[PDB]
Amino acid sequence: LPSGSDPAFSQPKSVLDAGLTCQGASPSSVSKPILLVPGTGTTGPQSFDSNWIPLSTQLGYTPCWISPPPFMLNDTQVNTEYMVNAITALYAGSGNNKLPVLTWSQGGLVAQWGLTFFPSIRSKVDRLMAFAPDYKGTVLAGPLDALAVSAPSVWQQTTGSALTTALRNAGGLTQIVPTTNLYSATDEIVQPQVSNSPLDSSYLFNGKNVQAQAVCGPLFVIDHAGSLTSQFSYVVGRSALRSTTGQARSADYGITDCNPLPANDLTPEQKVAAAALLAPAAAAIVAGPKQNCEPDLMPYARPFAVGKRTCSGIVTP
Amino acid sequence: ATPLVKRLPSGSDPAFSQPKSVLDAGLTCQGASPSSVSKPILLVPGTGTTGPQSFDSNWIPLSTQLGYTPCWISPPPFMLNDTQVNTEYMVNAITALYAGSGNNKLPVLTWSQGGLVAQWGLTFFPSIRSKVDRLMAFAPDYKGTVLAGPLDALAVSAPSVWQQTTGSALTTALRNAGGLTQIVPTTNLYSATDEIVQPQVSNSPLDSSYLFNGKNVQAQAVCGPLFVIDHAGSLTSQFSYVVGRSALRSTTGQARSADYGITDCNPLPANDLTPEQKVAAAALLAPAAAAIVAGPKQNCEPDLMPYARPFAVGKRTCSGIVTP
Ligand code: NA
Ligand code: NA
């Protein structure tokens, strides 16, 4: 993995701090923070108000989140600056104590990108619990050469992208901190996910890779959003957050937990909102940035994707 | 600024799967033993051929007339086996010829798969980087080729044909390990009209023969868009001889634009070849296509050796999905 000093941020600290919020606390003085990293086309609240904000509260954490603008549609590398800055802030604000990170969709790619390229946070993240992460991107976007004009981070989550290439070649498809990846073969956004194998976009070597169907059977169906919100997802995430190993444990879940509906402990209103989690993403995409090329890799990542084409041209060594 | 990133594998050479005696048996020099040879040049042949079949009609005599002792490897059977094994023959030969010429660097000159083999060796066997002074590659397929896939016609194909298919685990691993940037001074001579290796048309890093920082000479960029030489002509033409002569003589280790131009754009076999050599040069490809048909074939790409597996995790080879 990359070593040495962290790369410089492209955004000022004040901007990065403005993207971080905690429930009922300031990041500078917070007990048992958990950092929630949202999905493409959403803010922290839109990703987590109906699920892991209340669920982590009941598990004894202070939920905190980042909301990189606009709605996680900008450069994934910029979104990661928000996360790295937040880990640094919440580590100090909790008394110099490691904290867990819990993510949905792109948020897991962001987390692993930060752990790969910003060495200072490896000692500050206790564990990573990623729901439907797309470390390999998704092939459902189609080939890069045919992609319609799309948001910066949508380019970067397209399989074949310079970003996913650089993550892989820098060592980022192996876990860096104890990581659990919960995902679904029936994901309608991120594929391939069907093999229960290293082919899957959510898979990390040495991670606790939990394809729901491997536990629940081939008839179990949860979609991209259900991967975050389901009762099964809650049991796995609870296992990961409590485990002394930092990863979910098979002994903590079984067939009786294979309920695809929103987590039981959510209120009826939260269950409704959780089922409708994905809709704001489309609206943000319609109003959001669009371009005909993948954003350039920042200098710290360019050496890992020589030959790939971004907006400024082919990456050279 | 730019971070520190080792561009290539480092450390000790991976072990060979073949014993030294077997690798030595595949190496021959004209009129000399590798153990005591003056000014060797190592020639690495193309798919479906032996060293003599690739080079008897061209660079064996032409390099002799430039003052070298030509030496070649003939990995069996006819370069159709695992490209990684073919590379063991090349690595061993460099070690032997470096030692047999008094610890003096030597040039490597290749056709077709031979250039992929050379770059694979330089990428994964660090000991040879200080023993090769330059690489002169004719029609190298560092990205493989999109033409004539392994599932065309009979659903089995030679091991090295799988590996030379674009998207293969082998070509993926080479790229991910840093192998599409030159490692020693390299000249790549190729043709937009290559009928075996594509894509080659863009005169840019998209081309299968292109290496970053190399001297990448697409013939049409010098001779015009309607100049035609094929996969074999890329090795045998008079234009190719002028570029190769420049690369071998150059003090930079690469061909120099000053040494060739429009008046060298002769697509026929190199002038200095005898009539018999010119005829054989024009017919270079026929034995290779036939050997591919009669050789080993399988329905899967050979497994990557352990040294290469980390660079193609998630690809599929005969044993299953590649893991580190
Ligand atoms: Na958009
Ligand atoms: Na075939």
Question: Residue A280: what are its φ and ψ, rounded to 5°?
Answer: -60, -25
- The 3-state DSSP class for residue A209 equals strand
Whether residues B212 and A169 touch (CB distance < 8 A) is answered with: no
The amino acid occupying position B293 is V
d(CA A76, CA A109): 8
Taking a C-beta distance cutoff of 8 angstroms, is the pair B139, B113 a contact? no
d(CA B239, CA B224): 13
**Cα-Cα-Cα-Cα dihedral sign, residues B164, B165, B171, B175:** positive
Q: How far is the CA of B288 from the centre of ligand 2 (A)?
A: 15
Would you state the torsion angle of the CA atoms of residues B9, B11, B17, B18, taken in this order, to the nearest 10 degrees?
A: 110
d(CA A46, CA A36): 11
Q: How far is the CA of B298 from the centre of ligand 2 (A)?
A: 9
d(CA A221, CA A185): 8
d(CA A162, CA A168): 10
Whether residues B2 and A303 touch (CB distance < 8 A) is answered with: yes
Q: At what angle do helices B83-100 and B113-124 cross, to 10 degrees?
A: 70
- Please report where in the chains the tokens 């061209």 appear, as a residue: B58
Nearest to B110 by CA among B58, B146, B150, B162: B58
Query: What residues flank ion ligand 1 with Cβ within 5 A?
Result: A 151, 285, 288, 290
Backbone φ/ψ region at A236: left (φ over 0), alpha (ψ -120 to 50), beta: alpha
Whether residues B321 and A198 touch (CB distance < 8 A) is answered with: yes
User: Which letter does DSSP use for residue A127 in this model?
Assistant: E
Taking a C-beta distance cutoff of 8 angstroms, is the pair A140, A187 a contact? no
Q: Where are the alpha helices (DSSP H) in chain B?
A: 20-25, 51-55, 59-64, 83-100, 113-124, 159-163, 169-176, 219-223, 233-236, 238-249, 275-282, 286-294
Facing B180 at nearest CB: one of A168, A197, A306: A306
Annotated catalytic, B13? no
d(CA A54, CA A175): 27
Contacting residues of B for A198, CB less than 8 Å apart: 313-314, 321, 323
B178 touches chain A (CB under 8 A): yes
**Radius of gyration of the CA atoms of chain A, in A:** 18
Distances (CA, A) of B177 to A93, B114, B130, B170, B308: 41, 19, 19, 11, 8
Nearest to A231 by CA among A188, A261, A269: A261
A168 touches chain B (CB under 8 A): yes
Q: How many CB atoms lie within 10 A of CB B156?
A: 14
Whether residues B323 and A4 touch (CB distance < 8 A) is answered with: no
Nearest to A241 by CA among A127, A160, A87, A158: A127
Chain B residue with minimum CA distance to A304: B176
Whether residues A314 and B204 touch (CB distance < 8 A) is answered with: yes
Annotated catalytic, B194? yes
User: Which letter does DSSP use for residue B302 in this model?
Assistant: P
d(CA B269, CA B21): 36
Closest CA of chain A from B8, distance in Å = 11
Question: Residue A49: what are its φ and ψ, rounded to 5°?
Answer: -55, -40
d(CA A134, CA A173): 11
Q: How far is the CA of A287 from the centre of ligand 1 (A)?
A: 6
What are the beta bridge partners of residue B32?
A: B29
Q: Lay out the sheet containing A208-211: strands in order across.
A: A20-22, A62-66, A33-37, A99-104, A125-131, A179-183, A208-211
d(CA A42, CA B311): 34
Q: How far is the CA of B194 from the centre of ligand 1 (A)?
A: 41
Q: At what angle do helices A162-169 and A106-117 cross, to 10 degrees?
A: 50
Query: What residues flank ion ligand 2 with Cβ within 5 A?
Result: B 153-154, 157
A-B Cβ pairs (cutoff 8 Å, strict): 50
Question: Residue A29: what are its φ and ψ, rounded to 5°?
Answer: -150, 90
Which residue of the set B112, B168, B237, B240 is catalytic? Answer: B112
Nearest to A158 by CA among A138, A173, A172: A138
Facing B181 at nearest CB: one of A173, A299, A317: A317
Residue A232's contacts (CB-CB under 8 Å, 6 or more residues apart) are: A212, A215, A216, A220, A222, A253, A257, A258, A259, A260
Facing B321 at nearest CB: one of A169, A199, A299: A199
Distances (CA, A) of A198 to A160, A207, A211, B181, B315: 16, 11, 11, 28, 9
The amino acid occupying position B318 is C
Ligand whose nearest atom lies closest to the CA of B297:
2
A299 touches chain B (CB under 8 A): yes
Chain A residue with minimum CA distance to B313: A198
Exposure of B151 by Cβ count < 10 A (0-12 exposed, 13-18 middle, 19+ buried)?
A: exposed
Whether residues A304 and B181 touch (CB distance < 8 A) is answered with: no
B31 touches chain A (CB under 8 A): no
Q: How many whole angstroms from its chain centre is CA B319?
A: 27
Taking a C-beta distance cutoff of 8 angstroms, is the pair A87, A125 a contact? yes
Backbone φ/ψ region at A167: left (φ over 0), alpha (ψ -120 to 50), beta: alpha
A13-298 folds as Rossmann fold (3.40.50)
Token digits for A186? 């029936």
Whether residues A205 and B324 touch (CB distance < 8 A) is answered with: yes
Closest CA of chain A from B2, distance in Å = 6
What HEC string does A49-78 produce? CCCHHHHHHHCCCEEEEECCCCCCCCCHHH
The amino acid occupying position B25 is A
Residue B155's contacts (CB-CB under 8 Å, 6 or more residues apart) are: B299
The amino acid occupying position A140 is L
Is the domain defined by B20-321 classed in CATH 3.40.50.1820? yes
Whether residues B5 and A7 touch (CB distance < 8 A) is answered with: no
Ligand whose nearest atom lies closest to the CA of B152:
2
The amino acid occupying position A313 is G
- The 3-state DSSP class for residue A43 equals coil
Would you state the torsion angle of the CA atoms of residues B9, B10, B11, B14, taken in this order, to the nearest 10 degrees?
A: 20
Contacting residues of B for A300, CB less than 8 Å apart: 3
User: Which letter does DSSP use for residue B36 in this model?
Assistant: B
Closest CA of chain A from B173, distance in Å = 10
